[PDB]
């Protein structure tokens, strides 16, 4: 203990835990809403199954630093789940895509996501779309870096379907039910493998789905919304408009409660609020009005150990100096000899550090 | 600090929404400053500049910089207008989260997008936009049904890639002008934003050219990407030694080329940014740079800002809220409902459970 | 708004906001425990009168930091009220002592601390000894700086007093009185200014003077002590250890809310627990049992702003990277050291000639 | 692996890493200045040996906020050498003695600092009159926790001596020798085990003794000021006063590069300047213009591994919310001869909560 490692650290330090064959590892990597602040990503969960599967449900904007933080190379995150096509949920999809290729990413993304009401409303068509957003940046990275990595393969799902399989490899299964949600679309995930059950919310007005598919769950994860009073309080909301939003368009903490009770999970995770100093307690209190078992109030980088004997809630200390972690046909330019005739004569400058750095 | 009850002046730390910007006078925040690759210390490039006339402009929005953007307490509503320098993902990526975020926050104006044209319709700016709105046309459509859908429109002002020093953007006594970047392929561009006898430079993404050290000349601020060293490249990336040689050379710009170049534009002041800026990587960097500038000089990181007057350039780190929230400035009912019946039918009652706070908040 | 200032922000600045006439600020320098943490250094609270008038109440290991991030200058932070002589409750003093003085701090330190059962238990002895235990840093920066603003001015007042005045000046009062805690001599204050009236609990078990002599005020802090649970989960205490610590040792949470129940203040703050993601919680509704009004659970750099119509909690935004703000005898070497010099002309020549044009 | 720990990482997560048996570990706990901050602590340094002994080199205000990151028990870290009786540079002793003490050290600490010109300047003194300061705070814990971790046994050592064993146990050696700053007293040490040497240059204006018993350290350690520039636009100093402060009073960037090129360290560490974006890029070039050798440009939470083959430098990443961690422990009891420090005037106040508890309470003991 002088010389040697700290056990059972208070603390989880990305890229130092070995993951037993019996454990599953849960990180959220964006916990907040469709406004950006460095305390809150939003909505990105890592998981890491102990038979060394990797999934990424949801990778919204500002998501990727802590994904990143996770000290994972980036072969290892290639599979992603979308619960719904919001910004705030898919946002950062094009930040993994990039940043992975350049980073040594071999293996091309595979993504999982709901139908909508017409084709122009799904994840096919959304990612298709996406790709040709940044046509020019797969170009021009495609001749110099094999282009294999830089293609996404789309496996879209119908919303509708009510806890039907949308992936089953590896002894991982993926089942998925609706939400109500902004419009027809969204989804959560139940991810079952081992004996373990990993629900997913997503973001609903509390369903007679979720209680019933989510039953049971080692871990349930479910948007909690801020309070009626905190939407007058900080975004100006008037009196009756403030009620509806917890009732009409989100879950309400009180809702929250109702939905956990219904469902006895080891350890639920309410979500998708701004965690505050001044916001979170009220929201807990709306929680315990009608849940008493374990409960996480989940931020950025919070992580659930789950084992046959526990659900453990640490902190991730992580590197905000983040750097990628390595793991184990002719194509056309894209310059004119225009552009390329624009080059400066810089001989000179690099002449004393090329000379000794050649040495 | 003149009084005990009063405000302290000239604070050496800049709190954003604290300071009056004066007429004559530019504020520039590093937005971010990073890479292609993610981390929390470094956003990818974002750059916030103010003028004195009440005209706010974002140049480049990477991913990950929003936040930093957020936390500047700016209404929404001033920061409508976006140059990109490059079409990669860490030059434009977070442009959806301003287009979605600020349009859930109250914004009422569309986003109105400069950026280049490519050598042909689909490597250009035009093209990148229209498809990044289909791409998220569910968050389009769905917001559209319960908010008005004009803030959700994106004006694209593409221009001419090829253009020698040209004016891209003029209003308000505001000019913008481009010229072309040598860097991935055609397209990229450097900006000029020229205004009251003030020049500010946006360098973006390229090799060595002989556009920038010509145009940028005199600038009040001149920012130039300023790549890591060769050795770094290997310590860090473990790249085969010529590799790590031909990064510094022939892709980006070295410390030294900066160092040049910044010694022939004779900046008031200079920024060098693009480079993970950690406790074992800046040195060398920054002495790389004085091998041939001695000029004043930043070496940026998220969150430092320049303050522009006649008399001084001005470099202070920006101290500014980690839990932001947007701040307020100054509905279309005949659309069709993106739900179907089968999908509200769905609704769990929550009656009971939410009794006892719905009835304390009608009070 | 687009070149003017933001009005009412959601954040503390500190140094950007002019206090009104009839206002009050309290910063949270230090929240924490006898055990050290980046997050919450121990207990010291910073309170500026809209009079003009600064007064630190405890100065706690770790808070130096959160005070200098407040852009204040020394000269205007001189007072300082001791609530109990824990290294957790003044260990700092000798930073702010040392710190200021050699960033132009003119005046000396003024301290109020309590007596204790006998001489060598109060404030006066423990400066006093203070002093003489940094006797090296004193004698050596007397020689350089002038040694006025190296006094420090105790005023030790009797720790068994009840609810007695122990400063009057500028229309400012506190009294002190007793806590029940370690041993005799730890006190509890009440600032009292311009109607508003402010409570510094420091470290007690529930005791009957505080009920009383705290009744009313605008903002209440009291110690709000980890549950039993958490102090078998934290500290692998035996379960009857862990009972006792909540019931003769601290003030539970559900003790914090009996007290502001009986207390009503406008605005309650729990403190001297550590406020993590999993022990707030169950600190929060322990206190909720018995107490209902405005509660903030404090952590470093939560500020409150007490006005008229309003007791409001913000979290303060202040530079990690803290400097200074300005406001506005024989050596003590020996010749066989003074000959130890190097010479470094040569390393120094260039920079010299640059510097001097 | 998917499973497996990452290896040889990039940031030192304290805790996380098991020492080599030949290896040096040294963390930056401090390296500021006598004005605090968030962003540095005051000087401090934890040194741990492959062996097993662990010492804190100086223990300056703030400080100890940063070595309770690193996830050692206290019963460890009992071995504590001071090089200058500042604030800045022992202020956290009394933070380390108390804190301990409650959380549940079992053996005192062990203070090795300099005598001065006379008794009332070094360190004996010095800690004597701390624990007089603290009687109250030792008292009190002393009649609820056994009050043998509440002693500090001081090794007052002579600050004149010139490079003489002040300490000598388990083929560990520290040395001493003076430095130039303020008045007498301050001392550099060098620590010696195992064929490695890790020199702590205390504070100091250029010396002669430096350079001589300093020469081929593993790692240097030595004061390094901000420019003349720098005193100026800060602290509003007029020129000759800020010329004065960097030839008279303290070890300029330049001066530093001349004793590192003289000692030629495997690696130098610049250490007692704020680091800021606006201050650090001078004192690097300052120090380059006559040392080329390995520099770290010291911030809090910098880490050193020192092996036969390398002096790596990298950043610690540590937690923010931080607890004591258990290790090796006596369950000594109190002393029930203690008397107690209550009067029945203070315990007769005592409020009714019975109440108020008894739901918790309950539940509690089911
Ligand atoms: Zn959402
Ligand atoms: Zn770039
Ligand atoms: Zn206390
Ligand atoms: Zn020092």
Not at 84 to 89: F, K, V
């Given at each position: 203990?002088?010389?040697?490692?700290?056990?059972?650290?208070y603390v989880y330090?990305?890229?130092?835990?070995?993951?037993?064959?019996?454990?599953?590892?849960?990180?959220?990597?964006?916990?907040?809403?469709?406004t950006?602040?460095?305390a809150?990503?939003?909505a990105?969960?890592?998981?890491?199954?102990?038979?060394?599967?990797?999934?990424?449900v949801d990778?919204?904007?500002?998501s990727?630093?802590?994904i990143?933080?996770?000290?994972i190379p980036?072969?290892?995150l290639?599979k992603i789940?979308?619960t719904?096509?919001?910004?705030?949920?898919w946002?950062?999809?094009?930040?993994?895509?990039?940043?992975?290729?350049?980073?040594?990413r071999?293996?091309?993304?595979?993504?999982?996501?709901?139908?909508?009401?017409?084709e122009?409303?799904?994840?096919?068509?959304?990612?298709?779309?996406?790709?040709?957003?940044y046509?020019?940046?797969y170009?021009?990275?495609?001749?110099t870096?094999?282009?294999?990595?830089?293609?996404i393969?789309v496996?879209?799902?119908?919303?509708?379907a009510?806890?039907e399989?949308?992936?089953?490899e590896?002894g991982?299964?993926?089942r998925?039910?609706?939400?109500?949600?902004?419009?027809?679309?969204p989804?959560?995930?139940?991810?079952?493998?081992?004996?373990?059950k990993?629900?997913?919310?997503?973001?609903?007005?509390?369903n007679?789905?979720?209680?019933?598919?989510?039953?049971?769950?080692?871990?349930?994860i479910?948007?909690?919304?801020?309070?009626?009073?905190?939407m007058?309080?900080?975004?100006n909301?008037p009196?009756?408009?403030?009620?509806?939003?917890?009732?009409?368009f989100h879950?309400?903490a009180?809702?929250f409660?109702?939905?956990?009770?219904?469902?006895?999970?080891?350890?639920?995770?309410?979500?998708?609020?701004?965690?505050?100093?001044?916001?979170?307690?009220d929201?807990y209190?709306?929680?315990?009005?009608?849940?008493a078992?374990?409960?996480?109030?989940?931020?950025?980088?919070?992580?659930?150990?789950?084992t046959?004997?526990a659900?453990?809630?640490?902190?991730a200390?992580?590197?905000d100096?983040a750097?990628?972690?390595?793991?184990?046909?002719?194509?056309?330019?894209?310059?004119?000899?225009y552009?390329?005739?624009?080059?400066?004569?810089?001989?000179?400058?690099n002449?004393?550090?090329?000379?000794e750095?050649?040495?």
């Open positions: 203990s002088s010389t040697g490692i700290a056990p059972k650290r330090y990305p890229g130092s835990e070995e993951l037993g064959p019996d454990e599953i590892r849960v990180i959220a990597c964006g916990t907040g809403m469709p950006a602040r460095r809150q990503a939003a990105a969960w890592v998981v890491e199954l102990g038979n060394g599967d990797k999934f990424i990778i919204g904007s500002g990727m630093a802590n990143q933080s996770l000290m980036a072969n290892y290639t789940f979308l719904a096509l919001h910004t705030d949920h946002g950062d999809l094009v930040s993994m895509w990039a940043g992975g290729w350049t980073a040594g071999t293996d091309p993304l595979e993504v999982w996501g709901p139908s909508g009401s017409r122009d409303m799904g994840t096919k068509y959304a990612v298709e779309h996406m790709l040709k957003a046509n020019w940046d170009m021009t990275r495609a001749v870096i094999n282009p294999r990595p830089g293609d393969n496996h879209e799902f119908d919303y509708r009510l806890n399989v949308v992936y089953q590896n991982v299964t993926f998925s039910w609706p939400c109500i949600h902004a419009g027809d679309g989804v959560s995930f139940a991810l079952e493998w081992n004996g373990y990993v629900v997913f919310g997503g973001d609903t007005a509390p007679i789905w979720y209680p019933e598919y989510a039953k049971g769950a080692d871990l349930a479910h948007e909690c919304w801020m309070t009626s009073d905190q007058m309080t900080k975004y909301q009196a009756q408009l403030a009620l509806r939003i917890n009732l009409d879950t309400s009180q809702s409660g109702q939905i956990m009770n219904m469902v006895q999970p080891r350890h639920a995770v309410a979500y998708h609020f701004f965690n505050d100093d001044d916001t979170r307690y929201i209190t709306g929680v315990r009005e009608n849940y078992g374990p409960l996480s109030m989940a931020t950025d980088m919070m992580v659930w150990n789950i046959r004997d659900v453990t809630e640490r902190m200390v992580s590197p100096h750097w990628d972690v390595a793991g184990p046909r002719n194509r056309a330019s894209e310059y004119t000899q552009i390329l005739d624009g080059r400066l004569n810089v001989d000179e400058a002449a004393h550090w090329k000379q750095f050649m040495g």
